Design a protein around this ligand. Structure first.
Ligand SMILES: N[C@@H](CCC(=O)N[C@@H](CS)C(=O)NCC(=O)O)C(=O)O
Ligand SMILES: N[C@@H](CCC(=O)N[C@@H](CS)C(=O)NCC(=O)O)C(=O)O
Ligand SMILES: O=c1c(-c2ccc(O)cc2)coc2cc(O)c(O)cc12
Ligand SMILES: O=c1c(-c2ccc(O)cc2)coc2cc(O)c(O)cc12
Ligand SMILES: [Ca+2]
Ligand SMILES: [Ca+2]
Ligand SMILES: [Ca+2]
Ligand SMILES: [Ca+2]
Lengths: 219, 219
């Protein structure tokens, strides 16, 4: 009779996969109900979903009357109510701020730059990738490489929920802007490490593979 | 001998002014030291600042060894350590998530759309504003109008720190995409309310006026 959060989702979306990765890492796959909202079917444009989220985007989390409409806020909230006593705890204010700071980096920099390119490719706004498209992504790689020089994972020396949105993005934009282990060695090593998490395949690779298939169709 | 946070800032920046508004609202203007980093002088490109923040952007907050490089994470952190027992408290997990959700809206939607237009204008990438420029801003207004129909302020019925980044942005992009009280009545009424906060003039209007002058020069 506990209230279960409901995650409105399409796992081709990197923001969605950041949450899926988080749900698995926190061990709460059984406490979060899923509700599929298929982007290529345009189910995010249905009147109910637009009423739920005027941004008409996934993911969305509904928990009782709480409606979160950004993967990054969903991730922090799931940590608060399910991860306070574990390895992903955000109880310490400086630790919470370190993690939040890198969530902001993903939301405002890395995913923004990935989505300009990916949205243009999907809607056929771009047919050929020019340097104007990939240079901002490589600048984001440069920043990530600095972060992963200063700590072992994106926000500190331990894995945190901030690694999950960034790796969801990294594994997506990587198909059009591949990581060079020589130019970004700390980032490549971190990427390889994250792919080895036991839940990486079901929480992130499935969705990447579906998007790769959609991109092969449009290119 | 308490450690004072240091805010690296230029108040022409809406993200900076979201923090300045927060600092005043929390009553901590005396607990946060300021360090000016002038964008038009290119002080954000100096080697020290780039080492501090590879994104070479303001604001930055340094507190002991903690370095936050996004206004939205700075705002949440200042609430945690200075506002836990007051009217802007984020101690409740659902309240924190509501506020964080609208910070994400500002970081990922409203400010992103404001900055594409403002950056293009400043660097002369755009000389005339076309519908491709203002339509995404008006879509963001449509979402904000929904939020302000469901609650009195952006995140709930009380003023929260989420109102401050959004009003910093709103007062900036408003100079190129004016709010229509007939098309967005709840947003206009909220905007007028925020302008009446006693700290609005020094924390936000000064910086807007400087940017208006910079825009008059470039247009
Ligand atoms: N900042 C948001 C971004 C969400 C987002 O952009 N989702 C995309 C898929 S990657 C979407 O649903 N797009 C549909 C649309 O924009 O109409 C988050 O992290 O949740
Ligand atoms: N998401 C960041 C954005 C910061 C940002 O874009 N700041 C701009 C001024 S509005 C800047 O310093 N730009 C300089 C540059 O990009 O080189 C935040 O909210 O702090
Ligand atoms: O934008 C999209 C859509 C999408 C949205 C609406 C629609 O009708 C069909 C596909 C689907 O997957 C994505 C994955 C990304 O990594 C990204 O940056 C953007 C998108
Ligand atoms: O981008 C800028 C710069 C800027 C950055 C670097 C520089 O060398 C000179 C001005 C200054 O003020 C801004 C205000 C905004 O509201 C915005 O969206 C973007 C900017
Ligand atoms: Ca179930
Ligand atoms: Ca309906
Ligand atoms: Ca002082
Ligand atoms: Ca130096």
């Amino acid at each position: 009779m506990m209230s279960k959060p409901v995650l409105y989702y399409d796992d081709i979306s990197p923001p969605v996969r950041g949450v899926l990765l988080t749900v698995a890492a926190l061990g709460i796959k059984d406490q979060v109900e899923l509700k599929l909202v298929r982007l290529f079917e345009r189910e995010h444009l249905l009147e109910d979903f637009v009423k739920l989220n005027p941004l008409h985007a996934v993911p969305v989390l509904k928990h009782d009357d709480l409606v979160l409409t950004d993967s990054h806020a969903i991730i922090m909230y799931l940590c608060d109510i399910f991860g306070q006593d574990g390895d992903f705890s955000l109880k310490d204010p400086k630790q919470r701020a370190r993690v939040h700071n890198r969530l902001c980096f993903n939301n405002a920099v890395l995913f923004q730059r990935e989505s300009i390119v990916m949205r243009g490719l999907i809607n056929r706004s771009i047919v050929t990738l020019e340097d104007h498209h990939l240079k901002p992504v490589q600048e984001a790689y440069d920043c990530l490489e600095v972060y992963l020089t200063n700590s072992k994972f994106v926000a500190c020396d331990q894995l945190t929920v901030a690694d999950f949105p960034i790796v969801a993005c990294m594994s997506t934009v990587g198909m059009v802007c591949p990581l060079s282990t020589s130019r970004w060695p700390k980032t490549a090593a971190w990427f390889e490490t994250m792919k080895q998490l036991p839940y990486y395949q079901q929480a992130n690779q499935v969705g990447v593979d579906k998007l790769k298939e959609r991109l092969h169709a449009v290119m």
